[PDB]
Amino acid sequence: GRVIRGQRKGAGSVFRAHVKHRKGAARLRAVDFAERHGYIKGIVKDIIHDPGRGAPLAKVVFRDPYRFKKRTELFIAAEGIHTGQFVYCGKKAQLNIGNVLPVGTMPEGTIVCCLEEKPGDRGKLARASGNYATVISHNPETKKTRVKLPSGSKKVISSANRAVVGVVAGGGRIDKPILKAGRAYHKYKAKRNCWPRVRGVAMNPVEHPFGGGNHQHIGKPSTIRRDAPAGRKVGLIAARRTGRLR
Amino acid sequence: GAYKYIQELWRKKQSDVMRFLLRVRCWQYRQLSALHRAPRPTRPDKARRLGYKAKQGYVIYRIRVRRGGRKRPVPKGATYGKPVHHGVNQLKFARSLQSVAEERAGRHCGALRVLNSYWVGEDSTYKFFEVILIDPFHKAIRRNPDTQWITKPVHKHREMRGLTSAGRKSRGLGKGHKFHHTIGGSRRAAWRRRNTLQLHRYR
Amino acid sequence: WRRWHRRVNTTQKRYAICSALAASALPALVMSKGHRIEEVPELPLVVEDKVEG
Amino acid sequence: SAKAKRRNTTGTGRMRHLKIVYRRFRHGFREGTTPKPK
Amino acid sequence: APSRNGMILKPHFHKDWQRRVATWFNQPARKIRRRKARQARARRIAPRPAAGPIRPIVRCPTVRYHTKVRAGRGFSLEELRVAGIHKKVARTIGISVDPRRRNKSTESLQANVQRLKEYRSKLVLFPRKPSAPKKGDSSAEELKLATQLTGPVMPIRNVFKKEKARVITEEEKNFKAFASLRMARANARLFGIRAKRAKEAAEQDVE
RNA sequence: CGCGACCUCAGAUCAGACGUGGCGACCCGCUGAAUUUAAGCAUAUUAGUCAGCGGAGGAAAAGAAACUAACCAGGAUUCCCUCAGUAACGGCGAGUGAACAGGGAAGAGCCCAGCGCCGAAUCCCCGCCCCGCGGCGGGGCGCGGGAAAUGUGGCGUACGGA
RNA sequence: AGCGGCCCCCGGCGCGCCGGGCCCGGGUCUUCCCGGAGUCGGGUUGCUUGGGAAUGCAGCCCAAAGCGGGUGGUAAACUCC
RNA sequence: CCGUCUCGCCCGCCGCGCCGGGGAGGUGGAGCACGAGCGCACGUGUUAGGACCCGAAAGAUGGUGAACUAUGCCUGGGCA
RNA sequence: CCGCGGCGGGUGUUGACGCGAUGUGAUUUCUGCCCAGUGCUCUGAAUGUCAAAGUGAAGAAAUUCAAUGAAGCGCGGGUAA
Ligand SMILES: [Mg+2]
Ligand SMILES: [Mg+2]
Ligand SMILES: [Mg+2]
Ligand SMILES: [Mg+2]
Ligand SMILES: [Mg+2]
Ligand SMILES: [Mg+2]
Ligand SMILES: [Mg+2]
Ligand SMILES: [Mg+2]
Ligand SMILES: [Mg+2]
Ligand SMILES: [Mg+2]
Ligand SMILES: [Mg+2]
Ligand SMILES: [Mg+2]
Ligand SMILES: [Mg+2]
Ligand SMILES: [Mg+2]
Ligand SMILES: [Mg+2]
Ligand SMILES: [Mg+2]
Ligand SMILES: [Mg+2]
Ligand SMILES: [Mg+2]
Ligand SMILES: [Mg+2]
Ligand SMILES: [Mg+2]
Ligand SMILES: [Mg+2]
Ligand SMILES: [Mg+2]
Ligand SMILES: [Mg+2]
Ligand SMILES: [Mg+2]
Ligand SMILES: [Mg+2]
Ligand SMILES: [Mg+2]
Ligand SMILES: [Mg+2]
Ligand SMILES: [Mg+2]
Ligand SMILES: [Mg+2]
Ligand SMILES: [Mg+2]
Ligand SMILES: [Mg+2]
Ligand SMILES: [Mg+2]
Ligand SMILES: [Mg+2]
Ligand SMILES: [Mg+2]
Ligand SMILES: [Mg+2]
Ligand SMILES: [Mg+2]
Ligand SMILES: [Mg+2]
Ligand SMILES: [Mg+2]
After folding, report:
1. Exposure string for C21-34, b = 16+ CB within 10 A, e = fewer
2. D35: phi then psi, degrees, rounded to nearest 5
3. Phi, psi of E70 (to 5 degrees)
4. At E182, is the secondary structure helix, strand, or coil?
């Protein structure tokens, strides 16, 4: 049997990501003594933007208190950021947009973004075009804090990480239908290579288990168990329901 | 004096003393590299019963070897052939891990000639050893009349041809009814003497 | 390894020697073999021991 | 391929040291001495 | 595809045998090599015995062969402690010594000590320095008559005693041989049961 | 915070030494299949074989018993004849298949650790001189320096030994 | 052809000294000392061999002993050699 | 003569017994009943080996190719 | 998802308006009834069947017999774009 394409995207040869023009990793600022006892001032220098992927970045320049030098950084821009806006950053930080302050101190029901799942890893959650997490509760003993994610799920995070305040700028992107075809083509000429999907019934039976036959039909049930071999795991992966609920 | 009963200490391996000294030394050894030189042998008892005189020339390394069998280096399954020769998981290697350790520490330092090896510690996934190496051309080894047999060019790489005591077990030889099939030189010429036709002149 | 050589028994090798010595004494089986023996005075020709000198 | 060796072996080229070792062997690799000076 | 009546047989040639075939065309040019390396060995040691030092008299095992006497490896250390010879001189005068032999009998110990006493009286021993002997050396007479001994020294020969023709006793007419061989077979098979039923009767007779 | 000492560990275009790659007829160590036979075929056989990989030598390996036999007992290894196409294994089908004894070629045997005794009784290198030095060695001298009591030499090893 | 001749070269081994090195052996009797340890062996899984209730090798866990230990071709105990 | 079944009687002895030995009558055996083999050479016949010569479709180990064509990339060029 | 292998590698300089796996085929218009079957999933001591190990008894022992017994199949609910 020939190797189906799902058993062929895990090589790393032609399905790599186009990382030439990407201006840099949208990290956060690290931890130190100042971000644990006070705050520190940023001087946003421009809003240089990568529509390499579709979310706007931010150039934030900090005064570094160890050597005589100016550390640059990058962030993800919240909604309503100027050009020239004193972004503060720390734990004693006052509460408005652009500032970044720990999770344990902000009150309940505050719309945040770019949370750190662990008390320091420089930003890993809710950073896409137009999403926001909400802080649900707190707990003074055991030092934890609940939060609801934009999926719908909930999760417990220790109340020592950090988060910017405000939603991600770039919302409303899922509208304006791509009525053209090659305008999705110039979208996936960027990041990576998977766009012209060929359905499985059209294929021959040597590269897809569903295919083959005279009539375009499946024969086998599309729903498959998870404890399955690689290359059979092609259909609906696991089911709790399969239908018409709206 | 002591060497008679350091010997009898180093077979209290279940006791609380040696369960401490190994629950320490295996950790110390685990943060080091895979093949490094120690200046003196951890066991002098066992070291002297193999030929380690404490003079100039003799060197002692210390190497780690990972553990387990050997599964066959094929793609996914796909061992083409009859269904006897499908087996990939549960195969077992013929030579021991002790003469793996000897020839890993016998090829990396090619200017030396291996004498023997011994045991030190064990983890879940690691077996440690010690080795003894000899300078062939140093004047102290050279002018000894007893042990200038090494410098002869015959005894190059004793460990690749299988001559150490760790490979002598793998060859399968001795005397008796238990060792029929290595009469002659080895296992091969015990095959060659048999599966040939001696065609005489007159017959 | 074609079988080159042969072996013959012992007591046939000695019977052929006795049957080749018994016919170097007749003056007919020597003339008919081809030699020139018209004049030799005695067929088992025995000469003195000073020829080894 | 026992044919691709004999395209590239020892008996092919010059042997610019082996042919004067095959000559020096038969006198036990003498050095130093000379024929008698006359 | 066998025909009417021939024997069944299994030839062992299904393997590739033409690759490993040992010819023997060497043979009449190796009996000459061994003949030269044996005669140039026989002229290196000019008055010594050519056939190795003398070798002991030993029976043979395995009831098929237990009525012969053949050569051995070397003398033991009882056959040298009794004969009064030190065990590392005997290596230097041509006496084979192996330390791995027992002596469970006596009648071969004696005939070995006697054979040593023969060889010690045949042995011509040269002086170290041909100007000065020892107490036990030999005279300048025998040196001129010293020569080699080709062949195995004091060859081991199987001798048999003889007996003449006796007159038959009146007794041996009444000796039944076969009902004694089949009594010793029955008595040699019933040694455990006969000695066990008597024990069971000694456990039963306490009542 | 000092001068100090053993330990563990690095750097050098430090002094003097070494190994690395080739040939691959014979050799030792691993790895190792399928055609083919069975009138099919999957255990078997083809085979511990070709290919593949790493090491040597003028020869390599083996080797002085944790041995064979139940005899009135032999007595290191290798090599030829023999046992033998035999005891045995095996869809008990096709087929694979040893050794001991006996006669012969060759003949050779040994040392350390431990146990203990002799005042480290031990080596290697640097220095000066004399002899010889196209295989770098011997004797004399070095208040000249280094390694070894985590054990250097002598006697001594299962045939008993001191 | 021939124990025929001549001219060179390197050795094998025999003898004189001149040098240094090493002072060691038997037998008979009294008193002392004497041996190799994650290995033997046991269970198990896998390849193997003519080796068949498992010849060898290798892997995992368990793990010894001094009138003791292994072998003594059918597994198992008690025995004697 | 050996193997095996049926009927039933006497004898032996350092060991006295679940010891040992003997008879008549049918049945199974590649056996005796005054030898016929051993070693060599030649011939046919059946077989195992490449096996009267030529002939496949395939199967396995180990290696060489994206200078044509298939797709993603970098860098440049062209469309009255 | 790759891979003989490790703290290995791509997706990922990524984070649910995001990755990945499928069936239909513009818009307008509608998309019916059936969960018994084959699949899929969830409650499982609500339990019939269920290895090795570790446990008990009888034996001189090798052994033999009993209790207990994970997943999954069985039984019970959900699901037809
Ligand atoms: Mg088509
Ligand atoms: Mg398929
Ligand atoms: Mg249909
Ligand atoms: Mg098969
Ligand atoms: Mg060995
Ligand atoms: Mg026919
Ligand atoms: Mg240098
Ligand atoms: Mg195999
Ligand atoms: Mg077939
Ligand atoms: Mg056919
Ligand atoms: Mg077929
Ligand atoms: Mg075979
Ligand atoms: Mg096989
Ligand atoms: Mg193999
Ligand atoms: Mg090969
Ligand atoms: Mg090489
Ligand atoms: Mg050479
Ligand atoms: Mg050798
Ligand atoms: Mg050897
Ligand atoms: Mg011995
Ligand atoms: Mg033997
Ligand atoms: Mg026969
Ligand atoms: Mg059958
Ligand atoms: Mg024999
Ligand atoms: Mg001889
Ligand atoms: Mg010594
Ligand atoms: Mg000592
Ligand atoms: Mg087999
Ligand atoms: Mg092993
Ligand atoms: Mg038995
Ligand atoms: Mg017994
Ligand atoms: Mg016929
Ligand atoms: Mg033919
Ligand atoms: Mg096939
Ligand atoms: Mg190109
Ligand atoms: Mg493309
Ligand atoms: Mg659909
Ligand atoms: Mg249904």
Report:
1. eeeeeeeeebeeee
2. -65, 165
3. -135, 175
4. helix
d(CA E52, CA E94): 7
3-state secondary structure chain B: CCCCCCCCCCCCCCCCCHHHHHHHHHHHHHCCCCEEECCCCCCHHHHHCCCCCCCCCEEEEEEEEECCCCCCCCCCCCCCCCCCCCCCCCCCCCCCHHHHHHHHHHHCCCCCEEEEEEEEEECCCEEEEEEEEECCCCHHHHCCCCCCCCCCHHHCCCCCCCCCHHHHHHHCCCCCHHHHHHCCCCCCHHHHCCCCEECCCCC
Cα–chain-centroid distance for residue B152?
21
Q: Could you give the C-alpha distances from A152 to A25, A78, A163, E42, E59, in angstroms and in order?
A: 27, 22, 19, 106, 100
- B180 Cα to chain C: minimum distance (Å): 32
Give me C35's structure tokens: 């030699």
User: What residues pair up with E58 in beta bridges, in sequence order?
Assistant: E70
Sign, CA torsion B93/B94/B98/B102: negative
Residue position matching structure tokens 């992966």: A237
Cβ of E30 near strand F (distance < 7 A): no
- Scan for tokens 């609801």, then name that residue: A148
Rounded to the nearest 10 degrees, what angle do helices E191-204 and E178-189 cross at? Answer: 50
On whether the CB atoms of residues B23 and B96 are closer than 8 A, the answer is no
Quoted resolution (Å):
3.8
Task: Give me the A residues in range 56-115 that sit within 7 A (CB) of strand I.
Answer: none
SS3 of A173, please? Answer: coil
Per the entry, the structure determination technique was cryo-EM
Which residues, at least 6 apart from A188, have a Cβ–Cβ distance to it below 8 Å? A194, A195
Q: How far apart are CA A128 and CA E102, in angstroms?
A: 96
- Distance (Å, rounded) from C-alpha A67 to C-alpha E82? 101
**Which distant-in-sequence residues (6+ apart) come within 8 Å of E81 by Cβ?**
none
Matching residue, tokens 């399954």 = B77
Q: Which two tokens stand for residue E158?
A: 């199987």
Cα diameter, chain A = 75
**E24–B196: do the CB atoms touch at under 8 Å?**
no
Looking at the complex, report in whole angstroms how far the Cα of residue E29 sits from the nearest Cα belonging to chain B.
13
| DSSP codes joined into one string, D15-37 | -TTTTTTTTTGGGTS--S--SPP
**H or E element in which residue A133 lies:** strand A133-135
- The CA distance from A81 to A169, in Å, is 9
A184 in helix, strand or coil? helix
Pick from A16, A168, A26: which is nearest to A97 by CA?
A168
Task: Show Cβ contacts of residue B27 under 8 Å, excluding neighbours closer than 6 positions.
Answer: none
Burial of E30 (0-12, 13-18, 19+ CB in 10 A): exposed
B196 contacts in C (CB within 8 Å)? none
The helix/strand/coil state of C17 is: helix
Query: CB pairs below 8 Å between B and E: how many?
Result: 22
Q: Are B113 and B134 in contact (CB under 8 A)?
A: yes
Q: Is the CB of D33 under 7 A from strand G?
A: yes
Residue B48's nearest nucleotide, by CA–C1', is F113
> How many residues in chain B?
203
* B139–E contact, CB cutoff 8 A: no
Contact A76, A168 (CB under 8 A): yes
The C-alpha atoms of residue B158 and residue B103 are separated, in whole angstroms, by 9
List the B169 CA – G55 C1' distance (angstroms).
15
Protein-to-nucleotide distance from the CA of E24 to the C1' of H55, whole angstroms: 40
Number of C-alpha atoms within 13 angstroms, CB side, residue E80?
19
Distance CA E59, CA E112 (A): 12
